[PDB]
């Protein structure tokens, strides 16, 4: 997250770190056994880390649970990032508490202008690299679809939305991929892509979660 703020420990209780020896992506806990992330975050050997603040220090609220199965969306296209969503099942159920908590799925799509919370452990710089050890947060609005298309001609599908600031300075970034965009207590987006980070006229692009609720629910019900 570039241009954000330190969330505070365990203030974002649905945020997870996906770990394969190191943090590589975020995710969102949607029930005691299932995480949503980005399909471009797929790999084997994932350990889900819940209740994290400093990802480099054991602070006492963590739960580390290996993935038993990864399900990338049936129509994911890694060239376009269309349908950039995956589900990860935990080998054992998380113990849910004030610091480790699911986030509800949307019942309708969010509108441009809605305010949301975006969070992650990714790069905090637009030029060069600095990875924070504690979770960072950004409050940002959903942008109109016409502004999103205008920013990224030929690239924005009906499964994507833009959020952030066209003036630059505040955005998600590399290492935030797969993490949440939460609006009014509902998971509306997944950190997906963007041209650099925090650049003028190049807002963040997010997977539009409300298009996937039926797929998520049916997948959980049978897996």
Quote the least distance from Cβ 133 to Ca ion, whole Å: 9
Residue 175 counted as an annotated binding residue: yes
Quote the least distance from Cβ 135 to Ca ion, whole Å: 10
Per CB under 5 A, the segment of 50-58, 75-83, 102-110, 129-137 that binds Ca ion is: 50-58
Give which of 214, 212, 122, 204 is closest to 164, Cα–Cα. Answer: 204
Quote the least distance from Cβ 208 to Ca ion, whole Å: 31
- Residues 135/120, Cβ–Cβ less than 8 Å: yes
**Residue 53 or residue 176: which is nearer to Ca ion going by CB?**
53
**Residue 52 or residue 176: which is nearer to Ca ion going by CB?**
52
Q: Determine the size of the site formed for Ca ion (CB under 5 A).
A: 3
Residue 54 counted as an annotated binding residue: yes
Per CB under 5 A, the segment of 3-11, 51-59, 108-116, 143-151 that binds Ca ion is: 51-59
Per CB under 5 A, the segment of 27-35, 54-62, 103-111, 202-210 that binds Ca ion is: 54-62
Residue 167 counted as an annotated binding residue: no
Catalytic residues, which ones? 40, 84, 177
| Cα–Cα distance, 195 to 202 (Å, whole number) | 6
**Residue 59 or residue 145: which is nearer to Ca ion going by CB?**
59
Residue 177 counted as an annotated binding residue: yes
Residue ranges at the known binding site for substrate? 171-172, 174-175, 177
Residue ranges at the known binding site? 52, 54, 57, 62, 171-172, 174-175, 177
Binding site for Ca ion (CB under 5 A): 52, 54, 59
């Amino acid at each position: 997250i570039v241009g954000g703020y330190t969330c505070g420990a365990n203030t974002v209780p649905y945020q997870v770190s996906l770990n394969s020896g190191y943090h590589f992506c975020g995710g969102s806990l949607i029930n005691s056994q299932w995480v949503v992330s980005a399909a471009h975050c797929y790999k084997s050997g994932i350990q889900v880390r819940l209740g994290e603040d400093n990802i480099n220090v054991v602070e006492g609220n963590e739960q580390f649970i290996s993935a038993s199965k990864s399900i990338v969306h049936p129509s994911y296209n890694s060239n376009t990032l269309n349908n950039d969503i995956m589900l990860i099942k935990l080998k054992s159920a998380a113990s849910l508490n004030s610091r480790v908590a699911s986030i509800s799925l949307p019942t309708s799509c969010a509108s441009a202008g809605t305010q949301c919370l975006i969070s992650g452990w990714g790069n905090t710089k637009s030029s060069g690299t600095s990875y924070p050890d504690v979770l960072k947060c950004l409050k940002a609005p959903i942008l109109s679809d016409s502004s999103c298309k205008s920013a990224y001609p030929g690239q924005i599908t009906s499964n994507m939305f833009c959020a952030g600031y066209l003036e630059g300075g505040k955005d998600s970034c590399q290492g935030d991929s797969g993490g949440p965009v939460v609006c009014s207590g509902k998971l509306q987006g997944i950190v997906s892509w963007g041209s650099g980070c925090a650049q003028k006229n190049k807002p963040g692009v997010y997977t539009k979660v409300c298009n996937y609720v039926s797929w998520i629910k049916q997948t959980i019900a049978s897996n």
